[PDB]
Amino acid sequence: KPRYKPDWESLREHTVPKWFDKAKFGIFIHWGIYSVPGWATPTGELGVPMDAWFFQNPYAEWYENSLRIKESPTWEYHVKTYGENFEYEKFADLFTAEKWDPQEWADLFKKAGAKYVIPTTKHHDGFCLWGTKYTDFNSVKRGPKRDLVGDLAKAVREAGLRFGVYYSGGLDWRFTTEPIRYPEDLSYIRPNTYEYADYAYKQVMELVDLYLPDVLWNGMGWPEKGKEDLKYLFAYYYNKHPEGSVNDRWGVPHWDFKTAEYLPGYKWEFTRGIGLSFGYNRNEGPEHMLSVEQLVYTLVDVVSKGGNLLLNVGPKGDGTIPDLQKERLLGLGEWLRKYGDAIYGTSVWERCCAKTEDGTEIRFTRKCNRIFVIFLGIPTGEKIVIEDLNLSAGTVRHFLTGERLSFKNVGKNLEITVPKKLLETDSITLVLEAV
Amino acid sequence: KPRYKPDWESLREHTVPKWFDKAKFGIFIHWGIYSVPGWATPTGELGVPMDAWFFQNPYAEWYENSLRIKESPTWEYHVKTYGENFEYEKFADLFTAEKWDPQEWADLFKKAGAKYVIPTTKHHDGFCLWGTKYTDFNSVKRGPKRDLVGDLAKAVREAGLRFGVYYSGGLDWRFTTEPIRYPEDLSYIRPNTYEYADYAYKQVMELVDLYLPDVLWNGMGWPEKGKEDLKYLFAYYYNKHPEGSVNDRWGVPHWDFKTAEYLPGYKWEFTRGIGLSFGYNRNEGPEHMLSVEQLVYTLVDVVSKGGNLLLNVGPKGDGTIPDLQKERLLGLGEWLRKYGDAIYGTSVWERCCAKTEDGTEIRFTRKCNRIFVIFLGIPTGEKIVIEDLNLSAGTVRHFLTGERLSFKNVGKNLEITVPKKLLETDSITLVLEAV
Amino acid sequence: KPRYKPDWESLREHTVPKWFDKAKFGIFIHWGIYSVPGWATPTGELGVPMDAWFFQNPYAEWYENSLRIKESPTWEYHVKTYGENFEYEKFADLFTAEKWDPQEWADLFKKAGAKYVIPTTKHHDGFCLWGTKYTDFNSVKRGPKRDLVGDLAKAVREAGLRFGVYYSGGLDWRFTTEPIRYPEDLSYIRPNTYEYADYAYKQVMELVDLYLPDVLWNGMGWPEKGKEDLKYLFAYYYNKHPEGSVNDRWGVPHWDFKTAEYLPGYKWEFTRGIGLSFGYNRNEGPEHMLSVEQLVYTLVDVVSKGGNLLLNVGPKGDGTIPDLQKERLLGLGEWLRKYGDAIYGTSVWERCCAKTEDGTEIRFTRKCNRIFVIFLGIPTGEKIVIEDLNLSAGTVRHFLTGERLSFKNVGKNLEITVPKKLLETDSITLVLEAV
Ligand SMILES: C[C@@H]1O[C@@H](O[C@H]2[C@H](O)[C@H](O)[C@H](C)O[C@@H]2N=[N+]=N)[C@@H](O)[C@H](O)[C@@H]1O
Ligand SMILES: C[C@@H]1O[C@@H](O[C@H]2[C@H](O)[C@H](O)[C@H](C)O[C@@H]2N=[N+]=N)[C@@H](O)[C@H](O)[C@@H]1O
Ligand SMILES: C[C@@H]1O[C@@H](O[C@H]2[C@H](O)[C@H](O)[C@H](C)O[C@@H]2N=[N+]=N)[C@@H](O)[C@H](O)[C@@H]1O
C-alpha cells in the first residue's frame, strides 16, 4: 500500500495534484519578527540594479541581512529607532501578535477567492512560527507564546482552504555571521554544515508529521549535503499524503510545479507581493502596490498561460493585515465571485492570447467545450474586431448575462457586436463565451 | 604492530577466528523494555504472509512498531492493559530486572553447551542496556539502574564463554515517528541523518572500548552515510582484538561470517528463537516452540553444513528466563555433554547428508581422520542400509560405547549391523564413528 | 566586489601575499595545558627510529598521547609526579598563566626580528586558547579564565607584527580514546565523525570572524568529510581578508605556501623548535638546542632557497618564556638588526649556494640589482677564493662598512681580497655586496 519509492525515477510518478491545478489562486504569508520593524526602502522590482539590491533591499523580510550591512539605510533606521545595542534576535520578544485572529485571516483569504494558503514557517532569519523541538528560537517559547503555524492551519482548513508550508531550506542566518552583499555571496555564505542539513530535514519532517501540509514550498535551494535526503522525505510525504505537492526550489530532479518571480506543458506558479516586498513595509503606499484592476489582469494572464497566482500578504507584527492589502484582496475576490467560472477549474486553450484593433489585450481559458474570452478591460464600443482569429460555427454569447451575440469572420479577424447594454454591466473585464 | 589497515582490501586478511568456527553453538539474548509487556500474536515463521506480517507481528521486540499501528492487535492489547496514555518509552521505568542474576544465566548457557553469548545492547526501539553517554535512554539512568551489558559480560566470561554484542545499526525508533507497515517502508523509514550515523559509530566504538566483545553482530544494515566509517571501525576493532569477529549485516564489502534466518566455502550462522519470536512472548506455549529433539536435529544439520547455531533466549522484564526456555536449553546441553565430541571442533566432510531405506536422515561431521555418522533419530532395527554410500576399508564403530560394528558395501549402498544392545543406549541420535 | 569564488580553480587566483614572502622570519608558539607538565624524553629529531618515536616522544605537546601509552616514560613520570588518578584534562585547572604578559612576548618577538606570530589556538589535545562557544574545554572557562589568543592578537598587532593562527584540524584527542603508537595508527585513529568536521569548520570560521588572522596554519590534514567545506571557508576568508594566507596541510588542491619539517618556484616555510620539541620541555638544556650562530645559519640558508623560517617558542604554563629560548631569540635579532637588509624583502638569485676552497659555505640573496653574498662564518684570512663563480664587471664591496674590495676571475673561481680590518668587524657572517 505504499506507492512511492525513495528514488527520483519513482517520484516522477507523482504528478501535480488536480486540486492545485484547479485552484488557480493562493495566498502567500510572509510573517515573522521582521514584521515588527516592518521597514525597507521601496526601491522597485526584480529587473532595480542587482549590484545595489542587497544594499537598498526592498524586501522587508531581509531586514537582518540589511541590518548586518553597516552602510545600509536599514542600519541607520535601526540605530535611530531601536539603538545599536538592540540585536535583531530581540524582535522575537516584541513580536507578540496581540491582535491576531487566525479565523479572520482564513475568512479574508476565502472571500478574496483564494483556494490555498502558505505561511512562512521559517524564513531566512531562522525564527520558526511553530513549537519546534530543534530550536528554542520559535513562536511558542518567545514573543507570541503560541503555535502560529498550527492555529493558522486549523483556521484555513475550517474555512475550507488547502494549507501549505513555506520553509527556508537554503538560507538560515542563525548559522552565519556575514551578510549577503552581492548575489555571488550566496554561493558560499550558507550554513554549509552537516548539522544544518540534518536540522532542515528534521524540521520539514516535523512540519509533515504535525500539520501534513498540502504544499511543501521550499526557498533558496536545499543544502547540498542534504539533497539526497529529499528522496526519502518526498516518498515519506507522498505516502502519507498523495495529494500533497512540492515546488521546484530544492535543487533536485523532482518537483510538482515550477515557480516564477518575473504554452508550457508543465504546471507552474507566479508569486509576487501586493506591494514591492513580501514582509510588511511601512514605507509602501498605494504607489508601490498593484490595483484591484492589475491583480485581476495578472491573475487572468497567468491562468491563461497555465499557472496559478501565489499573491503575498505581509501582516504587521501585531497580527493585523494592513488595510491597503485587505482592500485589494477583497476587490480581487469581488471580481472572482463574479467571473470565477471563467478561472477556477479551467484549462489552457490552443492559444493564450490575442488583441483587438483598438489595442485591448485578450486572454483565453477552456472548460471542456466552453471557451472563455476574457478582455483585459472593457471596450467603449459595440463593434469589436479581434486580430488574427477565426470561428467556424457555434454560438458566441456574453458570459455574465448569457445573451447571444452576432459575429462573423472577416479575413484573418473575427468581428463581434456587443451591445453597450451588456458592456456596461461588466466589471474590469468583458467576458465572452463560445462553443 | 598494527596489522589491519582501514580499507576493504586490507580487512579481507581477517578471516573468521578459529574459536568461532570451533564453537558451533551460541546463545542470542533479546532482552529490553519490550520484555515487560512481552506480548505478540504468535502467527508463525518467516516464509506467514509478508503482507500482514507487520500488522500481526510475531516478534515481541517489535512491540513499539506494532503499537504505532493503531489497527494492530498490539494496540488493542496496550490500551486495554496499560491505557492509551501509556507511551512505549515508559516501559523503561517498569523494566526493573528485579530478579536478574547474571551468573545464573551464564551458568545456564554453559550447561546448555553454548560457547558464546550475544545480548541485544540496543535493539530497534533504541533503548541501550549499558551506561552509554550518547543517550539517557539507557539501563543505568532508567528502570534497572544498572549496566546490564557489562555485568553480563563479566558473568559470561567468568563462566568461560565468549561474549559478543548485538547492536541495531540499521533501525532506531528514537529517530522516526512512523511505523513499518510493509517491507518497502524500510527503504525510507530510517533515521537518515548524519547525526544518526555519528551516533551509531560512536556507540559501537563505545561498546568496543568498554567491553571489547568477541563478536560485533549488527542488525538491519548500517546507515548509508556511515558505511565508510566501518573500515576505520573494523581496523580499530581488529587491531585491539584480532580474535574479534563481525557478521554480514552491515551492507559493506567485509564480514567474517554470513547470517541466515531461514557445501559452502565460507563460515555462516543460523539464528532462530526457541519459540516464534526473539523477545519474550506470553502467548507462546510449547506448541510454538521447538522440542529438545528438534533443537538437536537442527544443531546437527547446521554443523554438518558448516554453520553455527545462534539460538535465541527471550527473558522476562524481571530478568528471569521462562521455564519453557530453560527446559529446552538444559535438554540440548544434556545431548551435547553426551555427543559433544561429534559436534564441537568438527569440520565438514565430503558430503553433508545421506539417508536410510527406512527414511532416517543422516548427517556427517569430520575430526581429522574420525568421521562421525549422526542419525537424526534411532532406527528400530539392527540391519541399517545407508543409501548411496561406500567405504573402502577401515573400522566403523559405535560412538558412545566404542564397540566395533560389522559392515559391507552392497552396490551403491552400505549395510551396517548395530545390535539393539547399542541402539538402546543412545539418546535422540544414533552416532557412529569411522576411520 | 567579492573576488574569490568557492572552487579550487578560482582559489588558485590567490597567490602568496607579498608581506609573507618579504617577512622571511616568524615565530610559532606551542602553548597549552601540556605546558604545565612540560615534560618529554629529549630523544632527537625527525630522521630517531620512527618505530619507537611515539613511545619515546620528544614532542612535549604529545604528552596526552604518550600518557595514554602505559608503557611510556611519560606514564611513569605522570603517576610519580601527579598520581594515576590525575587525568590529563585536569591540567586545564593548573594552567593559570599567572605571569603572562602578552606585550612582553610581542616585544620579544619584535626584537628577535620576527615579522609574524602564530600561536596554537587548539592543538591535538583539543583544548582551545580562546572563548569558543563550541566547547567548554577552553582558556576562558578553565585555568587562565582569559582569551589568550585574542589578548595575544592585540599585543602582536600593537607591536606591528602580523598575527596568524595554528589550528589542529586533523587531530583532536577529545574525540578518540586510543593513543597513536605507530604512524599507521594515524590513518584510522581520528575523530571520523561528521560532527567533528562541522566542529572544525565552525571553529576555524569563529577564529576568522573574531581575529581575522593573517595566516591560517592547519595541522595534521583536514577531516576527509569536511574537505569540501574548505573551498567555502577559503573564499570566505580571502574575501574578508585578501592579504590572508593559508598553509598546505589541509589535504585539498589549494595552498599559499608549502611547509617543511626536515630552487623551488613556489613559496615555502621551514618550521622547527629552538629545541627538540615544540611545547615546553623541562629536560631540554643547551645540548638539545640550536645556538644563535646555528639559527642565523639556518635562517640564511632557508631564505636563500626561497623560504621563511617559522621558529617555535615553547612557553611555561605560567606564561613565561624560558631564558634559554629568550636568549637565543635576542641573539638572532641582534644579527638581524645588523644584517636585515640582506634578508628582509630579498629574492632568490640565479643560484642559492657556493663554497670557498677553505670549505666555508656561502649563500646568496637578491634585492633587485644588489646581490648579497653571505658567508656561513668569517674566514680567517684576506684572500678568499669562491669555487665555481665568475663576475663580468661592476663593484663588489663589504656590506657592513661599504668599503670597495678588489677582485678578479681566476678560471672557474672568483678571488676577492677582504682586509682583516673589515673581516674583524663582522659578526657570525661575513656579508659582501655586488652590482
Ligand atoms: C518569495 C521570495 O523568495 C525569495 O526571493 C528571491 C527571488 O524570488 C529570486 O529567486 C532571487 C534569485 O532571490 C530572491 N531572494 N531575495 N531577496 C526570498 O529571498 C524572499 O524573501 C521571498 O521569500
Ligand atoms: C534476529 C532478528 O533480526 C531481525 O529480523 C529480521 C529477519 O532476520 C529478516 O532479516 C527480515 C528481512 O527482517 C526481520 N526483521 N523483522 N521483524 C530483527 O528485526 C529481529 O528483531 C531480530 O533481532
Ligand atoms: C609543528 C608540529 O607539527 C606536527 O608534527 C608533525 C611533523 O611536522 C611531521 O609532519 C610528522 C609526519 O608528524 C608530526 N607529528 N607529530 N608528533 C605536530 O604533531 C606537532 O605537535 C607540531 O605542532
UniProtKB/TrEMBL annotation, chains A, B, C:
Q: Which cysteines are joined by disulfide bonds?
A: C352-C353
User: Does this UniProt record's set of keywords contain Transmembrane helix?
Assistant: no
Q: Which UniProt keywords apply?
A: Glycosidase, Hydrolase, Signal
EC no.? 3.2.1.51
Broadest EC class assigned to this enzyme:
hydrolase
Question: What Gene Ontology terms describe what this protein does at the molecular function level?
Answer: alpha-L-fucosidase activity
Q: Per the database record, which ranges form the Glycoside hydrolase family 29 N-terminal domain?
A: 1-341
**One biological-process term from Gene Ontology?**
fucose metabolic process
Q: Which domain of life is it from?
A: Bacteria
What GO CC terms are in its UniProt record? lysosome
* Alphabetical list of Pfam families matching this protein: Alpha_L_fucos (PF01120)
Q: Which residues carry this modification: N6-carboxylysine?
A: K326
Function, in words: Alpha-L-fucosidase is responsible for hydrolyzing the alpha-1,6-linked fucose joined to the reducing-end N-acetylglucosamine of the carbohydrate moieties of glycoproteins.
Tell me the PANTHER family matching this sequence: ALPHA-L-FUCOSIDASE, ALPHA-L-FUCOSIDASE-RELATED
Q: Which family does it belong to?
A: Belongs to the glycosyl hydrolase 29 family.
Name of the protein this chain belongs to: alpha-L-fucosidase
Provenance organism: Thermotoga maritima (strain ATCC 43589 / DSM 3109 / JCM 10099 / NBRC 100826 / MSB8)
